[PDB]
Write a protein that binds this ligand. Structure first.
Ligand SMILES: O=P(O)(O)OC[C@H]1O[C@H](O)[C@H](O)[C@@H](O)[C@@H]1O
Length: 319
């Protein structure tokens, strides 16, 4: 019968990570825990819509930029976990509005995955650069997500501006658009469809491609030639949370060694962990071995930039 209260989680990681994380939390603390999974941008919209009568306690996973925007928008309540002492320097309080309205639970590398069987069958060379993806031979063979609803897609747009500049990122996207077969509402979906061979190339976070590989899909991960970007996975307590103590406990736990290791050991989710005492997945990428930009979480997690960039992308690129 009686348990130790409730926790309602709006999750934006994969369903597998969401399920493994909330299950392990629930079983440890005997908390009646539920979750729903939605894209990072979709989740922001939901929390904004529900702000007068909040339905969830915590927002777990997904990219940090929408969570940073929420903090700026007074949709979150700040909570500084003791566990932050164990979080890698530089990642302890990374959002636009400081004071840990949001905290960083993982790091994911942006890139693309390539179905080598499909390209080989079609006599199409494997691409290795972002710039390759605009070439004639990839028309109809690319899937990417939509930054209106997906955190991944916004991370990509932000990464192209930081690799290059804003006009050439948008010029890039105009050319890329001609080759896109589908814009997906969540970030993981291109990994699923490139794995099954419906399209040859998915743009997204590389650990989702590692998982598909591990399941037998003929995928090859590419960290592209020009360099690339990354997400921080966020955790945030929702302002007006009904179950506030269990929310704080959840934040403490998912920032801990124990909570983070559940993601790859039980949730099949191979992001880089931000806790300095956590065992890293042998399947995780090592950032020091990659050409990474220094992603400006503060500017791209600013509300005016999110809205300006996403509006410009819908207007100029998607139409
Ligand atoms: O792009 P979204 O739907 O917002 O999801 C973003 C999330 O998607 C993936 O599938 C990754 O496993 C997560 O590392 C990422 O944070």
């Amino acid at each position: 019968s009686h348990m130790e209260g409730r926790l309602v989680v709006y999750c934006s990681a994969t369903n597998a990570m969401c399920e493994a994380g909330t299950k392990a939390f629930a079983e440890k603390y005997n908390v009646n825990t539920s979750f729903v999974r939605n894209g990072s941008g979709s989740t922001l919209a939901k929390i904004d819509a529900e702000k007068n009568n909040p339905r969830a306690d915590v927002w777990y996973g997904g990219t940090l930029d929408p969570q940073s925007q929420a903090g700026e928008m007074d949709l979150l309540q700040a909570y500084q976990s003791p566990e932050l002492a164990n979080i890698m320097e530089g990642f302890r309080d990374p959002a636009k509005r400081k004071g840990n309205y949001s905290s960083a639970v993982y790091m994911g590398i942006l890139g693309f995955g390539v179905n080598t069987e499909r390209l080989a069958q079609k006599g199409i060379p494997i691409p290795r650069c972002w710039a390759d993806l605009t070439k004639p031979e990839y028309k109809g063979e690319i899937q990417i997500s939509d930054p209106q609803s997906s955190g991944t897609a916004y991370t990509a747009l932000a990464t192209f501006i930081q690799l290059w500049d804003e006009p050439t990122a948008f010029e890039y996207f105009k050319k890329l658009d001609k080759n896109v077969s589908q814009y997906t509402k969540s970030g993981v979906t291109p990994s699923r469809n490139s794995a099954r061979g419906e399209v040859a190339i998915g743009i997204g976070f590389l650990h989702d491609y590692s998982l598909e590989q591990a399941k037998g899909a003929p995928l090859e991960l590419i960290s592209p030639c020009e360099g690339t970007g990354y997400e921080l996975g966020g955790v945030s307590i929702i302002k007006g949370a009904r179950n506030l103590d269990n929310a704080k406990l959840f934040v403490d736990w998912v920032l801990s060694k124990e909570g983070q290791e559940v993601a790859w050991k039980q949730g099949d989710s191979y992001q880089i962990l931000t806790n300095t005492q956590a065992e890293q997945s042998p399947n995780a990428l090592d950032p020091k071995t990659l050409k990474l930009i220094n992603y400006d979480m503060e500017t791209y997690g600013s509300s005016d930039e999110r809205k300006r960039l996403i509006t410009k992308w819908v207007n100029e690129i998607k139409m």
